[PDB]
């Protein structure tokens, strides 16, 4: 997951 | 999603299909007629709903059946099978609830759980709820593990996990109704300040962010459509693929310049050849005109051949003069083209030093998300878990995320300061040998039917071993441990007496000066009520800032912040803490990542229990005795708190089925  | 359908989605379950797991517990139904499956699927979804609408009280099978309604409250054993399946695998009556039916005074079976982390606590609370004897062995003086929370006075700040990644299908959403957790939304507005301390202008900020996202999507293209997944008999990392993609775009810039200029020389050359025609025509017209003049000078009256010679040269002169006129007309068109072609020249750079530095900050962001240098992530698999992302905004815990472990840990037999040193598992049971951390001489031995290990992956990786398995773990389990990656990221928490930042922003960036130091204090968080600012150390910086003194590290923070708000608005901090997770011997890192050369299938290898060999040779193959939980054992939700917790619920269900027996399969 890039997490924004 | 709402209704009974929402219950399935909020339990990570398809509302209109039976999962692989339900197929196993209800093989009659999956192989049966479709009408009965809809009945089951309804009974499941309905029961889930009842739990979710009030997760502060146990959901008995009776209360479940009473609030069902025909034809669904007809087959009472199907309802009893559904409720029992859901209770067992922790889809209902998990977490902290009020027990209607108090647990039996007489336990059954003995389980030792290594680690009072969220995975360990979750399993423990479940096993105890099932009537087993659980004892947790904890090396630290506190529960929680990677859920750490600094508390001094009114200052509160998580050095461990601090974000709840959306409540859409998140089991933490249930724990949040069960525990008073102050969940606060996070505003996504992150302004990037460069090394000097000047805000990056918005136009530049959007095209680098846009480009970064384009670069990512590009790598996925290399991976899946071009099978660029091995290079020189080694697996490709995400970092390598980004370099190759950036190179191929820097090459395209150069190719497109050559192609442009090399089309100026195309015309400048046909211009040159046009002039050589025109500079010879002008010399032929210089010579005919002279001849015409001399022929015209012979005054009349003349013989017809001399009249012919005048009118002939006059013809020929106007002929060549019409030729030269066309070439000048043609020359202007070429001159216009050259004026234009120079006017629109393509960009000279793909990216420049200022541009790339801001790209580095988006790479530190990734390195933060995955707690590892992009050079270590698997290109193919690093994003293998993004299909299971939750919905909703990302949250932070205002009151300290320790409130969750501490809450779960009540009613549980936790031995703190008890470091497990050896794990012995035999066909007849298990003994765990631990010592007191405060004094290593005091030795403890715990005998049990089964060991649930929630040792962090980095502990499992330790060489020489911090924990010895007798007999040693088989090569398939050890190999998966080596292949998998355990990353690192650290936090610096900064405590002041007054807010000097923008209180309407939760988070702002700092753009590092080098690629190498891109992770070094690249990002700051304003999440709490008190004036506390949190600063991240990620990527290759993480494991290096751990050899630098806190005062120097705090210094560099102050420097960053002074550059932003001026040397006047930044006071010395009241209280300073800095994490050193890779150094922490009960973590040896921060959380797991899909290393290059690994895959998400290693996460499933981690979760396979171990079955000891027989004691007497020729004896029947025994039960499995060593189970594993924790963040590195859940393939679809690694490196998270909710994923740890889910793995705890999993093993507890698995262990109970093995030892208490599953009476819901008939």
């Amino acid at each position: 997951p890039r997490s924004f | 999603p709402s209704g009974v359908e929402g219950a399935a989605f909020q339990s990570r379950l398809p509302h209109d299909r039976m999962t692989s797991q339900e197929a196993a517990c209800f093989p009659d139904i999956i192989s049966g007629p479709q009408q009965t499956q809809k009945v089951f699927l309804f009974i499941r979804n309905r029961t889930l709903q009842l739990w979710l609408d009030n997760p502060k009280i146990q959901l008995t099978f009776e209360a479940t059946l009473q609030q069902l309604e025909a034809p669904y409250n007809s087959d009472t054993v199907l309802v009893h099978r559904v409720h029992s399946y859901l209770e067992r695998h922790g889809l209902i009556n998990f977490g902290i609830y009020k027990r209607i039916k108090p647990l039996p005074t007489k336990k059954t079976g003995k389980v030792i759980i290594i680690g009072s982390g969220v995975s360990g606590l979750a399993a423990a609370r479940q096993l105890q709820s099932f009537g087993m004897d659980v004892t947790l062995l904890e090396a630290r003086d506190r529960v929680g593990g990677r859920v750490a929370t600094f508390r001094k006075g009114n200052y509160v700040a998580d050095l461990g996990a601090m974000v709840v990644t959306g409540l859409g299908g998140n089991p933490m959403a249930v724990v949040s109704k069960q525990v008073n957790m102050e969940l606060a939304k996070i505003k996504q507005k992150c302004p990037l300040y460069e090394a000097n301390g000047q805000a990056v202008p918005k136009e530049k900020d959007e095209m680098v962010e846009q480009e970064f996202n384009r670069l990512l999507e590009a790598t996925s293209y290399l991976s899946h459509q071009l099978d660029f997944n091995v290079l020189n008999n080694k697996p490709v990392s995400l970092g390598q693929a980004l370099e190759v993609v950036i190179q191929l775009q820097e090459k395209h810039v150069k190719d497109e310049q050559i192609e442009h200029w090399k089309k100026i020389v195309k015309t400048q050359e046909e211009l040159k050849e046009l002039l050589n025609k025109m500079v010879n025509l002008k010399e032929k017209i210089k010579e005919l005109h002279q001849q015409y003049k001399e022929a015209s000078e012979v005054k009349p009256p003349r013989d017809i051949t001399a009249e012919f010679l005048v009118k002939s040269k006059h013809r020929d002169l106007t002929a060549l003069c019409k030729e030269y006129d066309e070439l000048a007309e043609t020359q202007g068109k070429l001159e216009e083209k050259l004026q234009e072609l120079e006017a629109n020249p393509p960009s000279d750079v793909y990216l420049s030093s200022r541009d790339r530095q801001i790209l580095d900050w988006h790479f530190a962001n990734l390195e933060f998300a995955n707690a590892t240098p992009l050079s270590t992530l698997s290109l193919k698999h690093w994003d293998q878990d993004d299909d299971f992302e939750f919905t909703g905004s990302h949250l932070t815990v205002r009151n300290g995320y320790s409130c969750v472990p501490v809450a779960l840990a009540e009613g549980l037999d936790i031995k703190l300061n008890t470091a497990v040193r050896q794990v012995r598992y035999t066909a007849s049971g298990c003994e765990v040998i631990a010592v007191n951390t405060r004094s290593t001489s005091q030795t403890f031995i715990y005998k049990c039917d089964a060991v649930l290990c929630t040792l962090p992956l980095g502990v499992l990786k330790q060489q020489p071993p911090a924990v010895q398995f007798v007999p040693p773990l088989p090569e398939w389990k050890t190999s998966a441990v080596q292949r998998m990656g355990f990353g690192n990221l650290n936090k610096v928490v900064l405590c002041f007496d007054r807010v000097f930042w923008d209180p309407s922003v939760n988070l702002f960036g700092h753009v590092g000066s080098t690629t190498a130091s891109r992770g070094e204090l690249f990002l700051f968080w304003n999440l709490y009520k008190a004036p506390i600012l949190l600063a991240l150390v990620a990527g290759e910086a993480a494991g290096i800032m751990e050899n630098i003194s806190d005062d120097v590290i705090v210094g560099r923070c102050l420097a960053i912040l002074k550059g932003i708000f001026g040397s006047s608005a930044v006071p010395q901090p009241k209280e300073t803490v800095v994490s050193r997770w890779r150094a922490d011997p009960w973590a040896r890192g921060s959380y797991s990542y899909v290393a290059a050369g690994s895959s998400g299938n290693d996460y499933d290898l981690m979760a396979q229990p171990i079955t000891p060999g027989p004691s007497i040779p020729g004896a029947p193959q025994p039960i499995p005795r060593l189970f594993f939980a924790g963040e590195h054992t859940i393939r679809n939700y690694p490196a998270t708190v909710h994923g740890a917790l889910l793995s705890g619920l999993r093993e507890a269900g698995r262990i109970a089925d093995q030892f208490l027996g599953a009476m819901y399969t008939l």
């Binding site: - | 384009r214 293209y221 290079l231 191929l248 090459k251 200029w261 017809i304 012919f308």
Partner: protein, 133 residues
């Protein structure tokens, strides 16, 4: 199926920059050097063109000759017949030119004239002579 637009990723291109450790830098200077050579080759020809641009200063305005208003007449003056025969011996069949020499006659008039006086002005031999050149 396709890369994001503006991203350029060729299967041939990727191997080219992956074959060796410094392969990307090699390819990316062989182009850097190549671009400068083309730039040099421009200003070479730019300077050369600037020179021939100078020789053409003044164009051909001094050598231009005024245009002539002349209503196309019909009859063949003995004079105009004689211009014709010399034009044929010096042009071959470019009637537009022969029209322009005599002038007062249209190409068709010239064209038909050839047949008309062809046996007398012995126009056959004249053309044969024109072809020797």
């Amino acid at each position: 199926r396709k890369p994001p637009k503006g991203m350029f990723l060729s299967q041939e291109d990727v191997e080219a920059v992956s074959a060796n450790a410094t392969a990307a830098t090699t390819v990316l200077r062989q182009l850097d050097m190549e671009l400068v050579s083309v730039k040099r080759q421009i200003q070479n020809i730019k300077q050369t063109n600037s020179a021939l641009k100078e020789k053409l200063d003044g164009g051909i305005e001094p050598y231009r000759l005024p245009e002539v208003i002349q209503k196309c007449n019909a009859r063949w003056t003995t004079e105009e017949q004689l211009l014709a025969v010399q034009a044929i011996r010096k042009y071959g069949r470019d009637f537009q030119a022969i029209s322009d020499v005599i002038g007062n006659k249209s190409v068709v008039q010239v064209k038909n004239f050839f047949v008309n006086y062809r046996r007398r002005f012995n126009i056959d031999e004249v053309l044969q002579e024109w072809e020797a050149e």
